[PDB]
Design a protein around this ligand. Structure first.
Ligand code: HEM
Ligand code: HEM
Ligand SMILES: Cc1cc(N)nc(CCc2ccc(CCCN)c(CCc3cc(C)cc(N)n3)c2)c1
Ligand SMILES: Cc1cc(N)nc(CCc2ccc(CCCN)c(CCc3cc(C)cc(N)n3)c2)c1
Ligand SMILES: C[C@H](O)[C@H](O)[C@H]1CNc2nc(N)[nH]c(=O)c2N1
Ligand SMILES: C[C@H](O)[C@H](O)[C@H]1CNc2nc(N)[nH]c(=O)c2N1
Ligand SMILES: [Zn+2]
Lengths: 411, 407
């Protein structure tokens, strides 16, 4: 089967054969599309086929398919599964797996960078303290004084699912949220619940607007423990605007390092439940969503006020106007402090080039349009006009339920 | 089977049960989602007729009544005898309104039941079609206080006798390739303009030349008519602050009127069924003006604004995009021509969704199309999960007739 995707801006038509290697499900059927739905303990039995698939891929990527080294490694993994019910990945296979999960991440506009990924192997980690040390080294290395480098840290795989490693935080760096008695929130509304858990776990909340939350870490199925990331390791950029000098008086800042820490890395059937990964921000992630979502810092009002826009009718597009300046501000602030960041035009242009390349070299690029198109100025970015095919390839990054819903407390 | 949709801005979770009536296919499988692709007999007809008539008589609180069964019989008799059948006016009205109700890409459906339907099933020639269309345009324009409408020409019979409007909208600006390499007017109609020229159009070779209608009655070769200029309401585009905006000399038409689609009611196919409502501002300002394949005026507007076009990171495209869109909305409101902003339109559609979940058990919605093409995440539809599925009656796309026709 061949599938064609067309670009309506340029009339370029590409052909997807890669979707034939797709295993997992989409959520969709012939009768329903779930493309806009946010979220649409293995036996030896299901495991070896998955192991075989991965190693055949691995071994094709290094040009050694059907080699003695390939067949030997197959035999080796076979025996290891039937003996221990699992297996261990060589370092090289871990690295390749991690790179490919990113590459396969259909909702990531940033994948032109997929091959430049520093993989830290934290598979020898046994304790929360160990996890905290690994995570600090990751932050420091990834930050690199503002010259951000992509990285991921891979803690030990699931075994019985009773001994899971987990970073309770959704991202390694995030600001606290405090729901107040009057129903207002101080700080980041997205993070209220997690903030409460942390408080419960004994964190002394500063109760400010931009309190970096403590890491909350579980090793080996144990109850999790709190650690404050050293402040010096947390690079932050104060937000100012190039023309509007009152923009600084809003007191805004953000952190430099986007680092997702709640996802599950699946490689060759193995499940890595703690695998924090980081890159660098696209400006709209902070300036549209983090500041201007209604259920977030929600500063459109205050900014429109200060610009003295006409706020009596939405047809003044006052919101659209405030939104753009806020985003100009984020990009200006990051660049000024020499903290890596990419604007939404640049990021989506790169991504189209990546995708084109991927269709030639690889025969596809699974892509989720709902997520790839930016949350402002959609159609003046080249991705709006690009037909995409969404399908799931392994290795992959998967969502997993928040651990406080499932965790069995030791006490 | 029962399906939940969550709004991530409000936590409201609605349960969709209406998709279980889903008739047609989506393009997707369990293996591949095609959510972002633009275009994924007598025996056949009685089920489709019955399905429709069942929902009709159910809509009017008379499911399984003599009148219901009698009509089911009558149509059954007529199909077996004639190989087609005819809708009662009431069925036509209900059908048309529901094709709109079921259009999963339309953000404007809160309005679906206020649709004026013009039964044009007695039309027999292109001149007739032209008369009906002019009357549509006039009724719907309504001196700028625009009103939704559809005009339904006769149904397909043997497909050798289709009625078609070759225009994609009733009202569009022409497009001409220039020896200068560049394109004069609207580049999305260049081919249609050559077919018009080719069929004898006297093009005035300007930038905003209202194209002529090209009408096909009874599968015959289509003919040309110029909509009375006096019936094509236009709006010159000015900005409430930038006085130099006028000098780009942009105008846009008031009436969005989709003419190229096929309407399916109870198995019957109406190939010429132009319909119209009114614009959401971004269709003109973001898409018609700023798309690279369209009038593409961003570069020129940003220059007059004297913004830094040296680097994409100054967001100069975005700054210019907003003003262009302020200017569209401003010029329409000033000339008193109905237009809706994307905030208002999406806010309306969320209220509609809730109504449709409550009163119908769902609302098929295609997020890719529902979320405006600018400022997506500050409109509420961005955070709203949607389920997209195909219900009948429906508007379907259909191939441009120049490819299908024989002369
Ligand atoms: C290097 C710079 C990077 C940029 C600019 C980039 C950009 C993006 C953006 C804009 C999104 C959508 C985020 C949202 O709106 O919430 C995204 C999602 C994603 N990215 Fe990338 N990314 C980068 C690096 C990476 C790296 C290094 C990985 C993994 C190694 C990755 C994996 C993903 C995954 C798994 C998602 C989806 C997360 C989810 O569904 O919650 N990203 N990225
Ligand atoms: C009354 C004011 C109306 C508003 C503000 C409205 C708004 C919209 C918008 C924003 C789109 C997406 C179009 C694009 O991006 O080009 C749309 C598409 C659509 N609308 Fe509505 N609409 C209205 C009236 C109607 C009426 C009266 C009908 C049918 C009788 C209808 C049927 C559709 C269909 C079938 C599509 C998609 C057709 C396609 O795939 O091109 N619209 N409309
Ligand atoms: C590594 C990386 C780099 C980069 N530039 N961006 C990212 C995306 C990070 C990210 C941050 C925050 C969020 C939460 C939304 C707030 N904006 C997300 C989406 C997380 C998410 C939430 C839900 C409900 C489901 C899901 N699959 N994923 C994803 C990762
Ligand atoms: C009735 C109505 C009201 C309103 N406010 N807006 C509309 C949408 C009209 C419209 C305008 C422009 C366009 C495209 C312009 C680019 N050449 C379209 C739809 C075009 C289309 C193309 C294809 C390939 C498929 C499809 N289903 N629809 C539809 C209708
Ligand atoms: C390729 C992609 O599906 C295409 O650009 C779509 C995206 N969303 C859209 N949304 C609307 N409302 N109108 C459109 O024409 C499109 N185009
Ligand atoms: C319901 C809908 O899928 C949801 O709002 C999605 C839309 N697109 C998105 N796109 C990105 N990049 N990040 C998001 O959180 C979302 N949210
Ligand atoms: Zn789908």
């Amino acid at each position: 089967r061949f599938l064609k995707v067309k670009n309506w801006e340029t009339d370029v038509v590409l052909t997807d054969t890669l979707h034939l290697k797709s295993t997992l499900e989409t959520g969709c059927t012939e009768h329903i599309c779930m493309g806009s739905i946010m979220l649409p303990v293995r036996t030896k039995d299901q495991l070896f086929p998955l192991a075989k698939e991965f190693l055949d891929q691995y071994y094709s990527s290094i040009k050694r398919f059907g080699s003695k080294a390939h067949m030997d490694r197959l035999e080796e993994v076979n025996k290891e599964i039937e003996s221990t019910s699992t297996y261990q990945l060589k370092d090289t296979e871990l690295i390749y797996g991690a790179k490919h999960a990113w590459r396969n991440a259909s909702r990531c506009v940033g994948r032109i960078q997929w091959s430049k990924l520093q993989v830290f192997d934290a598979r020898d980690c046994t304790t929360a303290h160990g996890m905290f040390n690994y995570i600090c080294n990751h932050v420091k290395y990834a930050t690199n004084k503002g010259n951000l480098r992509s990285a991921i840290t891979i803690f030990p795989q699931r075994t019985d699912g009773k001994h899971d490693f987990r970073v309770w935080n959704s991202q390694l760096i995030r600001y606290a949220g405090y729901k107040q008695p009057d129903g207002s929130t101080l700080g980041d509304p997205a993070n209220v619940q997690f903030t409460e858990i942390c408080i419960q776990q004994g964190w002394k909340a500063p109760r400010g607007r931009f309190d970096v939350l403590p890491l909350l870490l579980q090793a080996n199925g144990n109850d999790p423990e709190l650690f404050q990331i050293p402040p010096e390791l947390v690079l932050e950029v104060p937000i100012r605007h190039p023309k509007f000098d009152w923009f600084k008086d809003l007191g805004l800042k953000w952190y430099g390092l986007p680092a997702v820490s709640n996802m599950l890395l699946e490689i060759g059937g193995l499940e890595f439940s703690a695998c924090p990964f980081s890159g660098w921000y696209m400006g709209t992630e902070i300036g549209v969503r983090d500041y201007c979502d209604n259920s977030r810092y929600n500063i459109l009002e205050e900014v429109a006020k200060k610009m003295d826009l006409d706020m009596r009718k939405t047809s003044s597009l006052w919101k659209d106007q405030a939104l753009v300046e806020i985003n100009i501000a984020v990009l200006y602030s990051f660049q000024s402090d020499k903290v890596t960041i990419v604007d939404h035009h640049s990021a989506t242009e790169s991504f189209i080039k990546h995708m084109e390349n991927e269709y030639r070299c690889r025969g596809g690029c699974p892509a989720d349009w709902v997520w790839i198109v930016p949350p402002m100025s959609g159609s003046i970015t080249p991705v709006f006009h690009q037909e995409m095919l969404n399908y799931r390839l392994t290795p992959s990054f998967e969502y997993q339920p928040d651990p406080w819903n499932t965790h069995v407390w030791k006490g």
